[PDB]
Write a protein that binds this ligand. Structure first.
Ligand SMILES: [Cl-]
Ligand SMILES: [Cl-]
Ligand SMILES: [Cl-]
Ligand SMILES: [Cl-]
Ligand SMILES: [Cl-]
Ligand SMILES: [Mg+2]
Length: 392
């Protein structure tokens, strides 16, 4: 894969429909980072003298104009950050959007209304896609995190216009694309979180790619059970036991080094003030539950991370917002930070939340903001908002 970006096209004077992620948590805006993330792209376009027309979702209006999910305050904040009079349209298509576009000069920025106000957005209605296209000369997709769904502003519009990546999307495709096609090696994936179900596709696909597979989080206790170890009260998806067995068999047959917990932090009651102890993985008491990877396992996982040249991390080692269950996730973050020979890729939202929380985000090589998109990409899916981009 090799997609054109805004670096590869003549933009001066062009109306650019630029799909961004301004889905900020809200009364007023309470986290700004998504708007900041978008700045290099917007600025690059402004410097080239493009007419920058920004489209984003915000919250869940489910196909009608809800008044508290308008993009008006996001446009106000963007204006502050750019030091520019950013204009904002209360419709994202039709005559009002059209006229505000007609009124633009080169280097102007116009934020269109929340694309999710319109039922046809989620349905990828062709007529709405054509209406969005009527506003522009070129489609720039800078919202990797929205690109896994076929929506009018993420994919449909590319039926009518040329289509290229923005700066965030370009980097996401460079890093994740290389990880699937020609990773540095050894290549480890760390797969965690609470549920096997959520990570089935990723486990399956990355067992064809990695040298090392490391599991943790509540997901791992299904694997522990599948080996015939006792798991007490730990989370287990009984209908995924046989899948887990087959995954371990695939790893063995392929010579993938398969790392699961060798020791576990256990408790009788999940809570922020929980009483815990550490036990070996074949010694989980019948009335306790596994809640984190133990220190022996943290040491092993750190060694594997330090000896892997590419590590993709999707999912924590425990419910790390709970103080007593955070150390395994902290240790994995620290090992990635400490590993001077390792390209660290944070592949999902909860792993991203963890590295921000524990202070090492700055030291990660790439933190994906694709969310459900980054997972789908790493499962080897064709993302509608990526496929539609024009080939270099
Ligand atoms: Cl790589
Ligand atoms: Cl399978
Ligand atoms: Cl978990
Ligand atoms: Cl093989
Ligand atoms: Cl994650
Ligand atoms: Mg480093």
């Amino acid at each position: 894969m090799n997609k054109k970006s805004i670096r590869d096209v003549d933009l001066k004077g062009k109306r650019v429909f630029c799909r961004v992620d301004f889905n900020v948590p809200m009364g007023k805006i309470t986290d700004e980072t998504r708007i900041r993330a978008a700045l290099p792209t917007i600025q690059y376009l402004v410097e080239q003298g493009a007419k920058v027309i920004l489209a984003s979702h915000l919250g869940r209006p489910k196909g009608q104009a809800v008044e508290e999910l308008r993009l008006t305050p996001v446009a106000a904040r963007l204006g502050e950050l750019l030091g520019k009079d950013v204009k904002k349209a209360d419709e994202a298509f039709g005559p009002v959007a059209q006229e505000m576009v007609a009124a633009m000069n080169e280097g102007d920025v116009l934020v269109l209304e929340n694309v999710r106000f319109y039922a046809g957005e989620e349905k990828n209605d062709a007529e709405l896609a054509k209406e969005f296209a009527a506003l522009a000369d070129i489609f720039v997709n800078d919202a990797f995190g929205a690109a896994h769904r076929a929506h009018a502003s993420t994919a449909g519009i590319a039926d009518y216009l040329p289509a290229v990546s923005g700066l965030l999307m370009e980097k996401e495709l460079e890093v994740l694309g290389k990880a699937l096609s020609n990773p540095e090696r050894p290549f480890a994936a760390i797969i965690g979180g609470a549920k096997v179900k959520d990570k089935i596709g990723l486990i399956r696909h990355l067992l064809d790619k990695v040298d090392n597979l490391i599991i943790g989080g509540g997901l791992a206790y299904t694997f522990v059970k599948a080996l015939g170890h006792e798991i007490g009260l730990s989370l287990c998806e009984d209908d995924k036991i046989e899948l887990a067995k087959e995954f371990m068999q695939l790893a063995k047959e392929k010579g993938v080094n398969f790392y699961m917990p060798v020791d576990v932090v256990i408790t009788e009651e999940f809570s922020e003030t929980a009483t815990t102890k550490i036990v070996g993985i074949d010694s989980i008491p019948s009335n306790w539950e596994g809640v984190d990877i133990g220190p022996k396992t943290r040491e092993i996982y750190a060694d594997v991370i330090k000896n892997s040249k590419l590590v993709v991390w999707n999912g924590p080692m425990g419910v790390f917002e709970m103080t007593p269950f955070a150390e395994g996730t902290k240790a994995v973050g620290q090992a990635l930070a400490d590993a001077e020979g390792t390209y660290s890729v944070i592949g999902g939202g909860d792993s991203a939340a963890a590295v921000e929380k524990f202070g090492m985000a700055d030291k990660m090589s790439h933190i994906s903001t694709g969310g459900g998109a980054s997972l789908e990409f790493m499962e080897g899916k064709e993302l509608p908002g990526v496929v539609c981009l024009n080939d270099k």
